[PDB]
């Protein structure tokens, strides 16, 4: 991904303030409430028929953390998201059969979540940096589709 030196600092500084369990939980939770059809992949986690069941499902929250923690891994290799996420792209395509469009939807929710928690700090510029990050991550996870 094509990021300026000022943008990488911004990306790394904000993420050091990120609780991956809490925001991980919330990002995946918000995906499933805002775009209810994304709940199809997690139906085996328990009752997800309502917004409130979704928000209280221990497996959804724990998966959001796992997902954000993987997203954090990408941040450690921003010049090579394709290499970093190569195995996971193959995993999501071949084994999980996840439509990569979902990666984009999760990206958008992640930005709204960072904004929600960091107020003023998540400037238009900090946002621009993360919007480029989430699209890089999305593209990388989609890259090995076939």
């Amino acid at each position: 991904v094509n990021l300026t030196a000022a943008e990488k600092t911004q990306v790394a500084n904000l993420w050091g303030k990120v609780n991956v369990k809490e925001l991980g939980g919330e990002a995946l939770s918000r995906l499933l409430v805002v775009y209810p059809w994304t709940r199809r992949f997690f139906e085996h986690f328990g009752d997800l028929s309502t917004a409130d069941a979704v928000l209280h499902n221990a497996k959804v929250l724990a998966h959001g953390e796992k997902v954000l923690t993987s997203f954090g891994e990408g941040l450690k290799h921003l010049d090579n998201l394709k290499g970093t996420f190569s195995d996971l792209s193959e995993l999501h395509c071949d084994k999980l059969h996840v439509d990569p469009q979902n990666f984009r939807l999760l990206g958008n929710v992640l930005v709204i979540v960072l904004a929600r928690h960091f107020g003023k700090e998540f400037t238009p510029d900090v946002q621009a940096a993360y919007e480029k990050v989430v699209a890089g991550v999305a593209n990388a996870l989609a890259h090995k589709y076939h």
Partner: protein
Amino acid sequence: VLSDNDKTNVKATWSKVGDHASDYVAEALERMFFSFPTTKTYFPHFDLSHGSGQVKGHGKKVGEALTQAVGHLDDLPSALSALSDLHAHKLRVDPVNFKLLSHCLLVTLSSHQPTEFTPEVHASLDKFLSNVSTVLTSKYR
């Protein structure tokens, strides 16, 4: 939003398809799977090779639904109500995929009926297939 001319163009088009609806739609899905592999993530349970019984079966069922839509252009939400429920509650196909199938449907039509697929006819069919796509995702949230 579907003008009287758009409905005329749509029924004109589908009447030329004739008894080829099932084959054309079968061919549209294969075009979708080959050119847009992400859409294959919705059919891990199908053999998606050329000529597979499952795709042919699916083309037939999708074609019939389009035939119904063509027959009920004044009230698509009412003609597609059960499929609407199905795609919202169970199938849950991300809405970007409907455009990809619509696109492969136009390629199929255009390739099979070159002289009848005029620019204005194309314009009407695109509005229709987008209309059907809106109806089928209308209950997602």
